[PDB]
Paper text:
We used X-ray crystallography to structurally characterize multiple states of our designed systems. For both the AS1 and the AS5 systems, the crystal structures of the hosts alone and of the host–effector complexes closely match the design models (maximum 1.3 Å Cα root mean square deviation (RMSD)). The unbound structures show an open hydrophobic cleft in the new designed state X poised to bind the effector, and the effector-bound structures show that binding the effector causes the two switch domains to register-shift into the designed state Y. Starting from AS0, we constructed a new state X by shifting the two domains from their state Y positions relative to each other (by one heptad along the helix of domain 1 that contacts domain 2), building a new loop between the domains, and optimizing single sequences that could adopt both this new state X and the original effector-bound state Y. This approach maintains the open cleft in state X by introducing minimal rotation from state Y and simplifies the multi-state sequence-design challenge by minimizing the local structural differences between the two states. Transition between conformational states occurs by a register shift throughout which the cleft could remain open and bind the effector.
Several natural systems exhibit ‘facilitated dissociation’, in which an effector (E) can bind to a target–host (TH) complex to form an excited ternary complex (THE)20–26 from which the target dissociates quickly. We set out to design protein systems that undergo facilitated dissociation. We use a switchable target binder (host) and a flexible effector that can rapidly bind to and switch the target–host complex to induce a large steric clash with the target, forming a strained excited ternary complex. We show here that by explicitly considering excited intermediate states when designing coupled protein systems, a broad range of facilitated dissociation systems can be designed.
Residue numbers in the entry: 1 to 258
Write the structure that this text describes.
Amino acid sequence: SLREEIRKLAEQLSEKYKDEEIRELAREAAELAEESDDPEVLELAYEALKKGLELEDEEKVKLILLAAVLAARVARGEVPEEKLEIALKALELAEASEDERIIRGALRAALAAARTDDPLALEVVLEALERAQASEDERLIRAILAAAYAFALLAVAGASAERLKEAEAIVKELIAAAEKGASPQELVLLVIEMMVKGMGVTMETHRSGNEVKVVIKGLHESQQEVLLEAVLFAAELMGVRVRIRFKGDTVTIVVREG
């Protein structure tokens, strides 16, 4: 009755947490295990659901469950191995950290990557997370996570291969900048640049005192939503305050190192 026991763990995990994402991942893990005649998929699903009940951090719960679901789907040939590799590397970053910015950033990047099938984009995200894990500097890790997530959002939003290649160049610039000691504000600025280039527009940067103000004209509000999601999450990862203003078709982003 192993598969039914796995389902029981999923029901207790679903009673422990009311979160919609944990409940759906738990339901998917239970169902994939119940549909499997593979005793190793049952083994991983059992242990992932058992650790999920032992962990205190609900964001690490999500990471553990996402990796199990992706592993079960790789066992059925349903998803590319790169998505599992990304989830596992993200889990590795999260388990090495007490900083919830890194834990949440690792999950966001893994979930955003799970939403694209572009092989080129998956390899960029995986290489980014691998470079993060090869770091002792949690400051660099947070910068890389912000860049990887921003890049993955552009892929999910359907940016062209040429624009993703341009965004990938900015990912590399951002990582090199962080290694050289760029400020948190400057790293958030680089994420804005990545999104602006990835959406084919231009930006006008003003630096008054210690603030950075970016005026972006010519974005559709659907593009504005994706850009601001990337930038606001980057600001959370970098511990920087951002304030937004909309005037007409123009978005203005104020970045304060705070």
